[PDB]
Design a protein around this ligand. Structure first.
Ligand code: HEA
Ligand SMILES: CCCCC/C=C\C/C=C\C/C=C\C/C=C\CCCC(=O)O[C@H](COC(=O)CCCCCCCCCCCCCCCCC)COP(=O)(O)OCCN
Ligand SMILES: CCCCCC/C=C\CCCCCCCCCC(=O)O[C@H](COC(=O)CCCCCCCCCCCCCCC)COP(=O)(O)OC[C@@H](O)CO
Ligand SMILES: CCCCCCCCCCO[C@@H]1O[C@H](CO)[C@@H](O[C@H]2O[C@H](CO)[C@@H](O)[C@H](O)[C@H]2O)[C@H](O)[C@H]1O
Ligand SMILES: CCCCCCCCCCO[C@@H]1O[C@H](CO)[C@@H](O[C@H]2O[C@H](CO)[C@@H](O)[C@H](O)[C@H]2O)[C@H](O)[C@H]1O
Ligand SMILES: CCCCCCCCCCO[C@@H]1O[C@H](CO)[C@@H](O[C@H]2O[C@H](CO)[C@@H](O)[C@H](O)[C@H]2O)[C@H](O)[C@H]1O
Ligand code: CUA
Ligand SMILES: [Cu+2]
Ligand SMILES: [Mg+2]
Ligand code: NA
Ligand SMILES: [Zn+2]
Lengths: 105, 58, 49, 227, 514, 43, 79, 98, 46, 259, 84, 144, 73
């Protein structure tokens, strides 16, 4: 169908809609995690900033958890994504699940 | 004959709580009792006949 | 809070396995079941006629 | 006959039964491969935390899993049907023998020349001679010439039975009113055993078949002595 | 009120519950008969008596398991509970006739018990072939009682088929086409078409047997120009469709279970699944004489029946691979129902493959009327139809009852049964290849090791059946009420809660056409 | 699925009673018949 | 004349597993021939091929029953 | 010789049959015999779902020829969206018979 | 109307788990026992 | 209150009395065949008739008198009747298969011929041809009755339906006389077996179909049918055409080709 | 085929009554004539106790067990021949 | 918090790794301090404490991914109990052998089997592969 | 410290599937080769070797001398 970059750009556009509502935030994340991919940092960045516009800190943490979950046994993917998102995490004051202790079973 | 279906419609739509098989009146109950008595009595008799037929008779 | 499996799982696994092996070995060897294995390498043929 | 702990077919006594052995090896390889592949793919589908739950297009893969099974079926059917038509080929027998099933024994008629017939009953367990086989020996064996094409004709004088000798690859139903034909050819002398193969009442388990294959000259003297 | 509700029902859920209870009781009868078979065979010699008592037990075992356990549970039980809910219908089309399909089954079962109590029983095989089943070799009432038992079970199922086909064609939401109905509903529709067409031919054949036995007809008697083999054609024209009737609702339940516990909204390849069930239903009417390869048919007929039978592997393979593709990528929930469905995919595949071996008429000469056939059909029945029944029972018990099972106990139950059925039936392949016949109360000594193991497996399966009764007791004893069920957006039967109210869909669903 | 805690919890002792009664319901009548087979067969 | 008979040969009229009609036809042929020969004054020796074939193929009880029914006047085939 | 004497449905139909007949004459479908035609399904133009109570089950065939139907309860109040395609639905409760 | 809800949509009571155990014992145990008693019956004839 | 068009049926005893009637008829036939007694069979036949009467009575109450047969319910009953007829076609197919099996390969016991030695078939050009003209004529008169009903013509519906029933009765009386006059019997080997079981089940269906037509006649006398709503008449007419077509196959196969 | 008739325009009650009285009932009357013309007993053939006829494997459950249900003494012999 | 039977047709909460953002919050009713926390969440999240951030997470969600995905010791109970019940089965088989089965036939006696084995070798049972093929007729012993 | 490289993030399930379906195919071919050598050809060679110099009269004479026959002493 479409290139990787075209797919990524549609998803960035989706989450960047300024007046995205809570339902659309959830619909987007719950649809995105059905695909055979871990979303690119630029997609996650847009989704986290949507959480910020929706005043929803908890869903921002949950989205970081679902990035780690989608990587499965590929343990190198989540730390990479967190690395790429650190400027956004610092800017928005988003703590990672690990910083909150929410990676403990 | 005259068309008396409207009379039967009134009878069978009367708001009396009766199920359809009893809604014609007292004759329905009698015929039900006859049917159910013959069925249940006949079924007991069939079980007696099985008891009889399950053993040899010399 | 530990659940039933945390508390008793090790004991159920060890006891069930030990019991199962013991009682099937006893059944298979001690009560006179005739398994009729192959005579090959086991039976010394004997004159019959 | 079968031997203890046996896993597969009795060794072949006839060329058609050898053909069936090789055909079964071919088909069992396929059965093992497909069963193992399904078990393996189950294990593969069940052993990853990776997910993909959106709609999956089916059209492409359904070509694979209709075409490959169709090819496999053809690779089974081709040797299967070759053997089927071999078994049916014209062969010109030297001898015709009839067997009639009864409750619960077999009778045999050899009426090409003389009026020869007899009954064949299981040896009771209490009367077995030392080394004889429980439920398989008979009083009067079906003596036949080895290395010769024999027409067997099978029928019944009461209920259904079925006349079977596994090591020759034979099983022909015994149907009253019907005369079913099969061909028998042993490559070897010896004693070849079978058992009634259609439920026929109280002693279905207890009406076996024992063929005794010997050289023609011994068969001819046996036949004459049985008149 | 109790009589009105449970003897005079016109409600699809209560009638479904009646069928599940009847089928569960029949399954205990059928399990007891299977233990008697394996007790007789578990050591060499004679335990109970000669082959007459033994084959009365074998014949009843098959009739009970097929007509009183599998078909009532799958079609009467799961079909009545689930089909109306899955299409948003308020009941079956003929809700009162539906009740008579249920109430014909206790009389049918009574006739079968009676057949075994009078005279010396019907020791015929579940195929009831003459002349053994005729009035000289089976004089007296037993075989006539068996025929009448089959007549009543056949009327029950023909009326039930009429009801299901009518309900599924006529009572969907107006916007829902047949290609928007769930696969279990398709599997029940197809099964009902097979029942409608096949059971009347069985009824004709067994009526001809009844008149040869009692009215001096000679349909099957050569003395009057009849033919025992005609009865075999009429019986097997029904009997091959009958095995697809036994498995197709199971295929439907397996598609739902695998979809659900894979966390998917839909099965892989829906139209291929519909195609494959229809193809299997159609091909299942043109193959019956593979039950007759040793009767003396012409070679070209044997070749046809070999080839037509093998082609059924193609649509069946599409279903197996589609279940594997439904697992693919799933968020797998290792529930007890999923374990039953995964066992089904593998063990049904094994049994189907030994069926393909048997389809080769040349090889079937040596395998027919041996335990290789018994191994084939118990892989597809005890490890196929029964595994789909147990997966569907564990999955939908909370819907029907409103209570949950203990999942750890249900996994223990699956583990015990899995060992037991495989230990019972796998060695029966060796017994068949090495020539052990069917319907024997005793065997030549060489066959002892595998008969001993097979009987030990049957006792393990007994332990699992006893445990299943305790598990159902524990659930009703503890009363853990259901709260939330996931995936209701693609499993409509759960959306009215657990249990659903007596009347559901009094206001129909809204579905538009766009 | 989620569910409420049991309205009438069945303790391990209660489960052992239910399990034992269930098993004995199946095993005692069949065992009685099979134990007495010889008594039946010759009669 | 074409003796050294061993058994009944393959007959293309009856090539399948069910040989009932082979037995029947040869029994009829023998007895039809025999009736023809005895009538016009002739030798049943000319019927011998059919005799040998039906004796090879036919169960003894079938032949016996058919013989009994020909003697009784109840044999349903045409001779 | 065509005579009369056979009642018509207009004359003699009764009960629910008569209710359905009279509603059809008016172009009304209180007993849900026809499939409703979708709107554009936006939030400004939601699909309007009649009900005699305050919730009704919707099935959404999100795209033409989908075999999967998406089922959910629609409640009285603000429009809700199909969880698969997002198309909007709004309950319109009313009085007696649809 | 009729009773609705868990434990009420069945023809047997689950109000007391021990009465239920007895009823389930009798129900499933009678089906399992019947073939053994029919075999006994067939042996005691002849 | 419901807002669909389907019929929720009142709880009914007739499924149970019908099922018990089936137990009594079958155990009754067993008692008659083996224990020289007709008592159970007579009870079963009586309870079966009572069950059928009250069940179908209640269907008339539900539809003519209570209005529950909306078009959706009527469409379901059309499918139900079509599927029932298909099941009956397959029942007869088993008896046609038996007939062609036995007649196409006549065994030595028959003489190796069909008809068997000793069998003297009826002449298909005599009463069997008359029976064929009678059932074909009744298919024409039931079609006249149907169009009369649709056109609102009470008198001619009743006339045509009476003629149809009369012809069904004529067929049944003719067949009963032919049974008595036939020189062969059900015990005359497979010729008698196939002839009397297949024509006998057909005669049973003629009696059933004639009874169904008589029910429709009296319902029509009582004005139950409207010119557009009369599914019980449609079902009886479909069943009657099925009985006619089965007879045409019996006539061509057993009476004509098999003679 | 178009048979040889040819009405239509509208298949209706008047046409089906025309067919009933103009073709169907005349055909029944013709066949009734043809039948009640060839009736009158035809002689019964010699009795021959063929074994594929007069089957008795179980007594019939009525009468003396040896008479068929619609036994006609004139034309139905028993296994031992015609009644007297 | 408390989910009720009569809530069955309402949007519900679920912890599923494939449905990360459920249809409702885990906790819908808020105390005074929880209300003030949701107000503080409208300002910079850098000003929330770790504990405030955990509290916001636990208002929205019940279990974290690590919690909902945890493994358990249930397999030990399942396998162990299954082996117990399979073990119990052998008790049934021991009972059957003791009380139900009589002696087996005399053809399984050692001497009978030795004579029957010689006779099978004398008639060359399965001489190509199955049985007599394993006997060395030249050395009069089983092939090694 | 240094940054982490960008790993593959897309199609991880499909890549796993492809690799193991190929691996299953290679294993299937290996098994078919093994089975042909260990079962099918073994059986062909066992029957061919048995019959290559087989003397049926000698076999008969051994069986006769062992006393197995009814028809031959
Ligand atoms: C649920 C029950 C059930 C089912 C579904 C089946 C399904 C099949 N059966 Fe079976 N069968 C019985 C129950 C069943 N059978 C019973 C009870 C008997 C005995 C009757 C009696 O005598 O009492 C019997 C007997 C029987 C016989 C007669 C043997 C004899 O008596 O000598 C034959 C012969 O062809 C047969 C064949 C098959 C085949 C080919 C299928 C096929 O439908 C199976 C198709 C499935 C697969 C092939 C597996 C999945 C496919 C793939 C993974 C694709 C790739 C595969 C290939 C390329 C091969 N069965
Ligand atoms: C006039 C046309 C119609 C006549 C009908 C007469 C009564 C038959 C009633 C039902 C008929 C249906 C088929 C029953 C089978 C046999 C009856 C066949 C038709 C018939 O009536 O055959 C008669 C024999 O009846 C006999 O044996 C015995 C007759 C009575 C015993 C019937 C036994 C019960 C049958 C059980 C059927 C089971 C159905 C199951 C359906 C499952 C779905 C023929 O008389 P005959 O003296 O032999 O020959 C004439 C010599 N002059
Ligand atoms: C030993 C005994 C053996 C059996 C003997 C049977 C004897 C005779 C039985 C004859 C059958 C009588 C059937 C009477 C049905 C009456 C009810 C009816 O006809 O009901 C109709 C619905 O059809 C419906 O259910 C249709 C429902 C009935 C279909 C029946 C088809 C025949 C089945 C008979 C059994 C066959 C057995 C074959 C055995 C081999 C009512 O709807 P309408 O007509 O539209 O009216 C409404 C209008 O008034 C509104 O304006
Ligand atoms: C309330 C619902 C209905 C309940 C029905 C209960 C019916 C009970 C009546 C049974 O009576 C028996 O009937 C037998 C047969 O029916 C009789 O046997 C007799 O009947 C045969 C039939 O005529 C004779 O030929 C025999 O000589 C003779 O044994 C027998 O004397 C008598 O005890
Ligand atoms: C609710 C389920 C009930 C479970 C209870 C367990 C049942 C126990 C019954 C007694 O078991 C017997 O023990 C004997 C003593 O061992 C065995 O004799 C055996 O003893 C010898 C050695 O012990 C063997 O060599 C003999 O062959 C054999 O007769 C016998 O067969 C068995
Ligand atoms: C395939 C289904 C069955 C599988 C295996 C069944 C396992 C049997 C469980 C026990 O059954 C009991 O066994 C006792 C023996 O242990 C029997 O008592 C019998 O033997 C006792 C000891 O000799 C006497 O005291 C009693 O009076 C006498 O009834 C008793 O009747 C029977 O209920
Ligand atoms: Cu003879 Cu089985
Ligand atoms: Cu089949
Ligand atoms: Mg067979
Ligand atoms: Na035994
Ligand atoms: Zn949608």
């Amino acid at each position: 169908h479409e290139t990787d970059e075209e797919f990524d750009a549609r998803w960035v556009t989706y989450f960047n809609k300024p007046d995205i509502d809570a339902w659309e935030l959830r619909k987007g994340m719950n649809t995105l995690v059905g695909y055979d991919l871990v979303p690119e940092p630029k997609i996650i960045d847009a989704a986290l900033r949507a959480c910020r516009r929706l005043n929803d800190f908890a869903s921002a943490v949950r989205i970081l958890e679902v990035v780690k979950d989608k990587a499965g046994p590929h343990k190198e993917i989540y730390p990479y994504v967190i690395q790429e998102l650190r400027p956004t995490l610092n800017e928005l004051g988003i703590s990672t699940p690990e910083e909150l202790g929410l990676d403990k079973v | 004959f005259e068309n008396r279906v409207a009379e039967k419609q009134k009878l069978f739509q009367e708001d009396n709580g009766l199920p359809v098989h009893l809604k014609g009146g007292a004759t329905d109950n009698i015929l039900y009792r006859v049917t159910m008595t013959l069925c249940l009595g006949g079924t007991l008799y069939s079980l007696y006949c099985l008891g009889w037929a399950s053993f040899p008779h010399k | 809070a530990p659940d039933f499996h945390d508390k008793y799982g090790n004991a159920v696994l060890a006891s069930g396995a030990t019991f199962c092996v013991a009682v099937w070995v006893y059944m298979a060897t001690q009560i006179g079941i005739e398994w009729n294995p192959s005579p090959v390498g086991r039976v010394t043929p004997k004159e019959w006629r | 006959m079968a031997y203890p702990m046996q896993l597969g077919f009795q060794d072949a006594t006839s060329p058609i039964m050898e053909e069936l052995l090789h055909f079964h090896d071919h088909t069992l390889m396929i059965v093992f491969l497909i069963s193992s592949l399904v078990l393996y793919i189950i294990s593969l589908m069940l052993t990853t935390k990776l997910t993909h739950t959106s709609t999956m297009d089916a059209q492409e893969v359904e070509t694979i899993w209709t075409i490959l099974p169709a090819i496999i079926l053809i690779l089974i059917a081709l040797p299967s049907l070759r053997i089927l038509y071999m078994m049916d080929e014209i062969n010109n027998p030297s001898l015709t023998v009839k067997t009639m099933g009864h409750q619960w024994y077999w009778s045999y008629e050899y009426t090409d020349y003389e009026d020869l017939s007899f009954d064949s009953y299981m040896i009771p367990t209490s009367e077995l001679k030392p080394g004889e086989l429980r439920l398989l020996e008979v009083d009067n064996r079906v003596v036949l010439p080895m290395e010769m094409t024999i027409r067997m004709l099978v029928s019944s004088e009461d209920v259904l039975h079925s006349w079977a000798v596994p090591s020759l690859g034979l099983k022909t139903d015994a149907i009253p009113g019907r005369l079913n034909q099969t061909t028998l050819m042993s490559s070897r002398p010896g004693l070849y055993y079978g058992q009634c193969s259609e439920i026929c009442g109280s002693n279905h388990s207890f009406m076996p078949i024992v063929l005794e294959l010997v050289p023609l000259k011994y068969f001819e003297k046996w036949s004459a002595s049985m008149l | 009120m109790f009589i009105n509700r449970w003897l005079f029902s016109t409600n699809h859920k209560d009638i479904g519950t009646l069928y599940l209870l009847f089928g569960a009781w029949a399954g205990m009868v059928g399990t007891a008969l299977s233990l008697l078979i394996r007790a007789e065979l578990g050591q060499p010699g004679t335990l109970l008596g000669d082959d007459q008592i033994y084959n009365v037990v074998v014949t009843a075992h098959a009739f009970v398991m097929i007509f009183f356990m599998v078909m009532p549970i799958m079609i009467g039980g799961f079909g009545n509970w689930l089909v109306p809910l899955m299409i948003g219908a308020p009941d079956m089309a003929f809700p009162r006739m539906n009740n008579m399909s249920f109430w014909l089954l206790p009389p049918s079962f009574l006739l079968l018990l009676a057949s075994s109590m009078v005279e010396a029983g019907a020791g015929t095989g579940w195929t009831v072939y003459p002349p053994l089943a005729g009035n000289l070799a089976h004089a007296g009432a037993s075989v006539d009682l068996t025929i009448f038992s089959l007549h009543l079970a056949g009327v029950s199922s023909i009326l039930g088929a009429i009801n299901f086909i009518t309900t599924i064609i006529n009572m969907k939401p107006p916007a829902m086409s047949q290609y928007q109905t769930p696969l279990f509903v398709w599997s029940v529709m197809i099964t009902a078409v097979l029942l409608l067409l096949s059971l009347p031919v069985l009824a004709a054949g067994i009526t001809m047997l009844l008149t040869d036995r009692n009215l001096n007809t000679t349909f099957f008697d050569p003395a009057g120009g009849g033919d025992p083999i005609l009865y075999q054609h009429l019986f097997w024209f029904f009997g091959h469709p009958e095995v697809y009737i036994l498995i197709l609702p199971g295929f439907g339940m397996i598609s739902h279970i695998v979809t659900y516990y894979s966390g998917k909204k839909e099965p892989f390849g829906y139209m291929g699944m519909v195609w494959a069930m229809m193809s299997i239903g159609f091909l299942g009417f043109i193959v019956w004489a593979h039950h007759m390869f040793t009767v003396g048919m012409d070679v070209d007929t044997r070749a046809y029946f070999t080839s037509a039978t093998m082609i059924i592997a193609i649509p069946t393979g599409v279903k197996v691979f589609s279940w594997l593709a439904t697992l693919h990528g799933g968020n797998i929930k290792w529930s007890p129902a999923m374990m039953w469905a995964l066992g089904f995919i593998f063990l049904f595949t094994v049994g189907g493959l030994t069926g393909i071996v048997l389809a080769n008429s040349s090889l079937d000469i040596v395998l027919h009327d041996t335990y290789y056939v018994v191994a084939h059909f118990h892989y597809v029945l005890s490890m196929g139809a029964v595994f789909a029944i147990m997966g569907g029972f564990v999955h939908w018990f909370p819907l029907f009852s409103g209570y949950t099972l203990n999942d750890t106990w249900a996994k223990i139950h699956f583990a015990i049964m899995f060992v037991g059925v495989n230990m019972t039936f796998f060695p029966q392949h060796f017994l068949g290849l090495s020539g052990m016949p069917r319907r024997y109360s005793d065997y030549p000594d060489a066959y002892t090791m595998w008969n001993t193991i097979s009987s030990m497996g049957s006792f393990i399966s007994l332990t699992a059946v006893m445990l299943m009764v305790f598990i159902i007791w524990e659930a009703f004893a503890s009363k853990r009420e259901v709260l939330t069920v996931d995936l209701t957006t693609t499993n409509l039967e759960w959306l009215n809660g657990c249990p659903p109210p007596y009347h559901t869909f009094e206001e129909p669903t809204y579905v538009n056409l766009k | 699925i989620t569910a409420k805690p049991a309205k009438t919890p069945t303790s391990p002792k209660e489960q052992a009673i239910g399990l034992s009664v269930t098993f004995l319901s199946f095993l005692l009548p069949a065992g009685w018949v099979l134990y007495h087979l010889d008594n039946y067969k010759k009669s | 004349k074409i003796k050294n008979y061993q058994t009944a040969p393959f007959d293309s009229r009856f090539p399948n597993q069910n040989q009932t009609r082979n037995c029947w036809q040869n029994y009829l042929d023998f007895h039809r021939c025999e009736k023809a020969m005895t009538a016009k004054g002739g030798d049943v020796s000319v019927c011998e091929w059919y005799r040998r074939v039906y004796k090879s193929l036919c169960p003894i009880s079938w032949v016996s029953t058919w013989d009994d029914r020909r003697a009784e006047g109840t044999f349903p085939g045409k001779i | 010789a065509s005579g009369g004497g056979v009642p018509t449905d207009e004359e003699q139909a009764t009960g629910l049959e008569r209710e359905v007949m009279l509603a059809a004459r008016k172009g009304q479908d209180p007993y849900n015999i026809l499939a409703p035609k979708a709107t554009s399904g936006t939030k400004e133009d939601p699909n309007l779902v009649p009900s005699i109570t305050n919730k009704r089950i919707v099935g959404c065939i999100c795209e033409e020829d989908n075999s999967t139907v998406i089922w959910f309860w629609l409640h009285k109040g603000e429009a809700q969206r199909c969880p698969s395609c997002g198309t909007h639905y709004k309950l319109v409760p009313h009085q007696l018979a649809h | 109307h009729y009773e609705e809800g868990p434990g009420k949509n069945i023809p047997f009571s689950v109000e007391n788990k021990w009465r239920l155990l007895a009823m389930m014992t009798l129900f499933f145990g009678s089906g399992f026992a019947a073939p053994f008693f029919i075999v006994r019956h067939q042996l005691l004839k002849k | 209150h419901q807002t669909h068009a389907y019929h929720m049926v009142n709880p009914s005893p007739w499924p149970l009395t019908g099922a018990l009637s089936a137990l009594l008829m079958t155990s009754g036939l067993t008692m008659w065949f083996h224990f020289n007694s007709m008592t159970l069979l007579m009870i079963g036949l009586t309870t079966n008739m009572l069950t059928m009467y009250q069940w179908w009575r209640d269907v008339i109450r539900e539809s003519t008198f209570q209005g529950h047969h909306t078009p959706a319910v009527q469409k379901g009953l059309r499918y139900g009747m079509i599927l029932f007829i298909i099941s009956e076609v397959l029942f007869f197919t088993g008896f046609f298969w038996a007939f062609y099996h036995s007649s196409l390969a006549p065994t030595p016991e028959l003489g190796g011929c069909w008809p068997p030695t000793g069998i003297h078939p009826l002449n298909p050009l005599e009463v069997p041809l008359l029976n064929t003209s009678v059932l074909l004529a009744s298919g024409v008169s039931i079609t006249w009755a149907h169009h009369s009903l649709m056109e609102g013509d009470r008198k001619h519906m009743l006339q045509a339906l009476f003629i149809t029933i009369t012809l069904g009765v004529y067929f049944t009386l003719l067949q009963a006389s032919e049974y008595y006059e036939a020189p062969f019997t059900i015990s005359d080997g497979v010729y008698g077996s196939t002839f009397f079981v297949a024509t006998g089940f057909h005669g049973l269906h003629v009696i059933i179909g004639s009874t169904f037509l008589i029910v429709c006649f009296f319902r029509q006398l009582k004005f139950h049918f409207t010119s557009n709503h009369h599914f019980g008449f449609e079902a009886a007419a479909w069943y009657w055409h099925f009985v006619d077509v089965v007879w045409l196959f019996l006539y061509v196969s057993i009476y004509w080709w098999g003679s | 085929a178009s048979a040889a008739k040819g009405d239509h325009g509208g298949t209706g009650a008047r046409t089906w009554r025309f067919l009933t009285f103009g073709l169907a009932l005349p055909s029944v009357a013709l066949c009734t004539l043809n039948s009640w013309l060839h009736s009158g007993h035809r002689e019964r053939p010699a009795f021959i106790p063929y074994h594929h006829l007069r089957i008795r494997t179980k007594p019939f459950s009525w009468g003396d067990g040896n008479h068929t249900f619609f036994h006609n003494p004139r034309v139905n012999p028993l296994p031992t021949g015609y009644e007297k | 918090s408390v989910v009720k039977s009569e809530d069955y047709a309402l949007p519900s909460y679920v912890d599923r790794r494939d449905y990360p953002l459920p249809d409702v919050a885990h906790v819908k009713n808020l105390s005074a301090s929880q209300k003030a926390l949701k107000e503080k969440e409208k300002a910079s999240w850098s000003s929330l404490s770790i504990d405030e951030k955990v509290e916001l997470y636990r208002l929205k969600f019940k279990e974290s991914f690590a919690e909902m995905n945890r493994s358990t010791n249930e397999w030990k109970t399942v396998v162990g109990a299954a082996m117990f019940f399979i073990g119990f089965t052998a008790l049934l088989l021991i009972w059957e052998k003791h009380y139900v089965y009589g002696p087996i036939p005399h053809t399984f006696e050692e001497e009978w089997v030795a004579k029957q084995t010689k006779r099978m070798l004398d008639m060359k049972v399965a001489p190509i592969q199955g049985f007599s093929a394993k006997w060395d007729y030249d050395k009069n012993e089983w092939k090694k | 410290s240094t940054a982490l490289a960008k790993p593959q993030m897309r199609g991880l399930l499909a890549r796993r599937l492809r690799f193991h379906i190929v691996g299953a195919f290679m294993v299937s071919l290996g098994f078919a080769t093994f089975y042909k050598f260990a079962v099918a050809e073994k059986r062909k060679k066992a029957y061919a070797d048995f019959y290559r110099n087989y003397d049926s009269m000698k076999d008969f004479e051994e069986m006769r001398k062992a006393g197995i026959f009814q028809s031959a002493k």
